[PDB]
Symmetry: C4
Subunit: 207 residues, 4 copies
């Protein structure tokens, strides 16, 4: 099959999404870009992650046309494709429905520098205002909210994280969910101390 390495990685990390508590049911989705071929591997729509085999992963071109695979691709494919067209620094995307990130997103709040781990995404994580799932409007909002960042919150929906490879993309998703938990819990009982912008700059270097 085409993009065999990518296909296996998508199956592996999809199970890891369920396992890590980063999603419920068949929510969320994962993609990996093969920059040499201009091909995108993406999780299939509505399938259980532990029932998903490499053959079930769908291969698309950057026009969004199916090149290999009989499964329907993720309904959120437009939100994946835009990053592989309009930036060149992202080769893998992890979209989650994780509870603490979705909590902060459902308030419409940004995630500020509550932890040094925020630097996995940038100096902060923005919240993109609501757009209907599976639309080009959501794809545009997600991209715009993530400019010069590796993650963005999606209002009343979840989070998407991107990086140079799938290992780092998953790490950003997991560590930003953890940061959202800390922000949620601190705000429950007080006002968290935040790291200053020059330190976030410093941390960007050290990471």
């Amino acid at each position: 099959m085409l993009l065999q390495k990518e296909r296996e990685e998508i199956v592996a990390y999809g199970k890891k999404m369920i396992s890590s508590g980063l999603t419920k049911g068949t929510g969320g989705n994962i993609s990996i870009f093969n920059r040499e071929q201009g091909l995108v591997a993406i999780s299939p729509s509505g399938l259980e992650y532990y029932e998903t085999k490499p053959e079930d992963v769908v291969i698309l071109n950057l026009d969004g046309e199916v090149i290999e695979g009989e499964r329907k691709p993720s309904s959120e494919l437009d939100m994946h494709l835009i990053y592989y067209r309009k930036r060149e620094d992202i080769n893998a995307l992890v979209h989650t429905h994780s509870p603490y990130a979705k909590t902060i997103a459902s308030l419409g709040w940004e995630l500020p520098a509550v932890s040094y781990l925020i630097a996995f995404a940038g100096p902060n994580v923005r919240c993109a205002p609501y757009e209907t799932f599976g639309t080009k409007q959501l794809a545009d909002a997600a991209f715009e909210g993530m400019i010069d960042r590796r993650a963005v919150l999606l209002a009343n929906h979840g989070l998407i994280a991107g990086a140079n490879n799938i290992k780092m993309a998953f790490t950003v998703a997991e560590e930003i969910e953890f940061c959202a938990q800390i922000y949620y819990q601190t705000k429950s009982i007080g006002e968290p101390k935040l790291l200053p912008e020059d330190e976030m700059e410093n941390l960007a270097k050290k990471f």
Copy 2:
């Protein structure tokens, strides 16, 4: 045995209830309707879900009489039977004692459109006022609270979800518990943004 497929499904999804954190101990219960025969498979009362075998599932008719099985049927059988008599769009029911739904229910609150996932149930989820467990009064309150919905909260008790089959019924139960977690956490620290009614209408179509 009668309703063999249904019996196995009830054992499988009952374990999944415990596994998913949707219940504690022997609380909660599951039923599946065979519309062709007018027979209902239901979980047995007070048995551990991982100790429950297909033979332990009880088969009832719509009058509530036992047709096959020696176990006592769920004490909440009346709350199951009413949906198979007074609607025709539900063929499976999942009743849970899950913590975030039970939290919202114990405040006596409705669950509003905090997430697009609410559309699994409808535009919102109502809270039925308290009635004693295992009574016809609770069965009536649950049904009335769930009119034109696929789920309802039960005050100081839990949640019940229904759908055209057991896979979708479980999905509604799990996704509505998740929505209740988001509502609980957002209300802990602020006021969540809610989706407008026309969008919930739109989402009802897209789902």
Copy 3:
């Protein structure tokens, strides 16, 4: 060995304590009374529950003297023995360090009728004021706080539950921890609705 059935049950339910999230490390302890012999089986002090074998369980008489076993008995043995001396309706005790019960206990609050499941313990669960762990003062406070109940909260410490056998004692411990979670979460965002005393009386019968 003496009380072989009891010894095996203590090992089994001790693992279940760790497994269920009802304790951390070697905290907590379990006892089972053999009323015919006047002998008490109790978990050993400071041992890991998954490393504990039936031979490690200690057998005491009601004077608190070791009858069989070389391990040191639980440091909280006095808090167990008092129930087997001063009541006759309890034959097994589960003492937990579970997070939501310990939360309510550390505020010094009672647990009111927030759920019909409270009836596993009684109309409510009292909070015994603080006494040093492993003392006769704590044993007295626990007993007095649990008069005409099957569970009591221990200020800044945890919970103890008792019943006619070990299966029901564990059930009380688990369901009361769950009720404490509901109380904690409802109080986080509002004021829970409570069940009236006549209904708790009714539920006492139905259980």
Copy 4:
């Protein structure tokens, strides 16, 4: 290999960190001091705990020079070495990124005597003000914050715990995380009762 017993212990307890929910990803780190040789075993930087083998553990001297091992040592090695130079009562350290401790630390708050379990660390746990991860400034702040204690909170970062051996060090880390959960949850809904200083003195003896 040198410090073989220590190497195996570091691999075992590192997995236990992930398993127990005391860290995310490759965050956190563990060290064990061999006082007879003046050698320190420490977890390797940036490696997955379930992928870490005893050969991957790094052996350092108290000057911070690598003596055996080809992996890069933990980026937080300075924060480990200072305890083995400037005290003589600590032979093992567990550094965690656990959620409730990190919550209290991100408010800049001390952890007071909310539970008798606090005595695993001392009469309270201080919060060291923020310093950049992997620096000598953080090492100094951590040490100073932990004077006459077995644990300290690290602002916007996590916790470190130390004791006479690795079993007790892990226990301090786990029990102090649990105490932080209780403090966080009590503060969410009220004002916890605290144990008086003379009782914490008493508990220091009894432990």
